[PDB]
């Protein structure tokens, strides 16, 4: 995707996460966890099954047409309806083959991008507390029990609370 | 200082190759299939009316061939015309046959208005051994066949009929095509016929043709079969010095005409379903099928592909 996580600096996926599509992996003194994030989840879900939506009801209602199967050639009238048809399907075979490719290509890159905006709010919470790896993890430079693993899952993690501990084990 | 946290996203051991711009081989986690490649072996009769003509094609049921009593005030929104439909009668052709065949199936019912023509010295009601409705010689039931007076006279006859009502009528008619100069008036007084329907707008006319035609039928002859629509507030005239195959009335046109035909050989079953191919209903939410480019209803779309994958996940890279 345009955003290079996803098949990117995200090596793989995780086939053991299976309530959610993207979470969180840590390891501290005491364990390691593996747990969804439902907001990230939640988005790249909302915007394929959008997709899915406008899609799935189209309205193409007909009754009365056009013959478009003949037994014997008749010339000049048969042509024409033979090319009417002809030159419909063809338009139309062309419009489904583009619109998934775009949609497909679309739906990859918000994927992508969706794994990205995981990674930046984490990155954005920890302040100056961690440092990338480069694979998608961050070394955090404190001791960071499984309360303080969860307050950055959920959110309300406040950096000034480990910040000396932190800088300290960072640069010295 | 040493914990660390994790950003990831889920896989599955084996996912499903769609196609994208650049790339016509990308797995994906799930995926979505958005043509329709599998029709049900009958048609349904819900919630669309459908019209079984059996073995009367509809021309032949609106010419009330022997067998075609079943379509009498018959509507439909689909008729479903048999590929095995048999002729019952007398042999005949429609010069724009293709054309009348088009108007009934649009126009959608099947409502006949009996009126009846004060016709002068002339016979009426011949009938005919190709044409033999259950145990007997017989003709179309909404045509009448006319054939000389028991004096060797038929005169001009010039009969009208006014449409002061609030819709279009559908007068269909006919002409009688003999083999043999001796045939021709063995039955009518002159050589040549002849037929001239008018409104106020237009006037057909037909001159019969004598000749050896080829014989399945039994027989020699042919009737020509016409159509003439009569607005309300138009007229219509039949002169003959011979060989008509007049009317028994009209039919009932419909002002908004949305109905259609399905030419197959599918059993109408008893599933639910407003789409229909040829080759049997579909009951499908994709937008795409492969099926049959002969559909009618509220369908997908008709394409050549027999697979488009819609990606409904991510990439799918595993372990
Ligand atoms: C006299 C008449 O109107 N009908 C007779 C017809 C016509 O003479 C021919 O169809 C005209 O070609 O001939 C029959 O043999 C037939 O076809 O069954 C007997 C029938 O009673
Ligand atoms: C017969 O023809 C005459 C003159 O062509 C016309 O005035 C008359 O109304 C016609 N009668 C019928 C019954 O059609
Ligand atoms: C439609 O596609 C399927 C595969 O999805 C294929 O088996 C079938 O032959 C196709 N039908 C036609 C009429 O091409």
Redo the contacts with the bound molecule.
Sequence with gaps: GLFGAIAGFIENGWQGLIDGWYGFRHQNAEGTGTAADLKSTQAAIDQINGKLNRLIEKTNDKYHQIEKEFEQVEGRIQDLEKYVEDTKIDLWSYNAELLVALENQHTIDVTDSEMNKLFERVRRQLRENAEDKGNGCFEIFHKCDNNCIESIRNGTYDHDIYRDEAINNRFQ | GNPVICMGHHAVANGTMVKTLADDQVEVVTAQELVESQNLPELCPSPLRLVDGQTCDIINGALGSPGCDHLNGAEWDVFIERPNAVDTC?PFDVPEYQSLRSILANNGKFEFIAEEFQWNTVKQN??????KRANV?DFFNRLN?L?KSDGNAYPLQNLTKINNGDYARLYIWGV?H??TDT?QT??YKNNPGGVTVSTKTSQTSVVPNIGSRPLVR????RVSFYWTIVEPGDLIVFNTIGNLIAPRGHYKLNNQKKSTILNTAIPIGSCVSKCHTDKGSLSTTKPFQNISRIAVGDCPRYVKQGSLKLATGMRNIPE
């Design positions: 007398y011949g009938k005919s051994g190709a044409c010689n066949w054939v009688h003999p083999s045939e063995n039955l039994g027989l020699s002859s």
